[PDB]
Amino acid sequence: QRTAVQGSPTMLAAISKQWVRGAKVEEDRIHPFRKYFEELQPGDSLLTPRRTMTEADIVNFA
Amino acid sequence: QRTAVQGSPTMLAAISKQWVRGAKVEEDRIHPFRKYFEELQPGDSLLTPRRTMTEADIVNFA
């Protein structure tokens, strides 16, 4: 049965057992590439440090 | 005997047979890396050419 489930994205994430687009995140102080498959939860996020794009970046990549 | 020798750094260089911080220098038109050990004097200096630090230098070194 094809059901169109509505609701908040943090609700659709827990319904679908995935992470969708605007759901809440589980930032837990260690890098998710260190976790094995069984301890990765859908929602395990990571806020990386920034990087300033410069003209030298464009030159070196081109 | 431990002796605190006061004086100018260009005098402490000649006393200590070393170079100090503000002693006189012996710039002699050839490179001190070309000299052997016996013809290196403490005070043989070299004023190098310049290099302008840019954002591309930071990017390429990082």
Added chain:
Amino acid sequence: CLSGDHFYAHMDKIAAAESIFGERVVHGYFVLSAAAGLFVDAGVGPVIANYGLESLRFIEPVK
């Protein structure tokens, strides 16, 4: 160096021998970047923007 991707299968010689690949392999994003280095015209033409990428799969490793 440029991308910043210092993954062990690319920058380590020991762990790449212990990995699934056998030795150090080229980055997949460098295959993707050097490809666009090969097929893109430099001159001004009808092509305007990159707009996205549809469906990428890396099949065999590049050494």
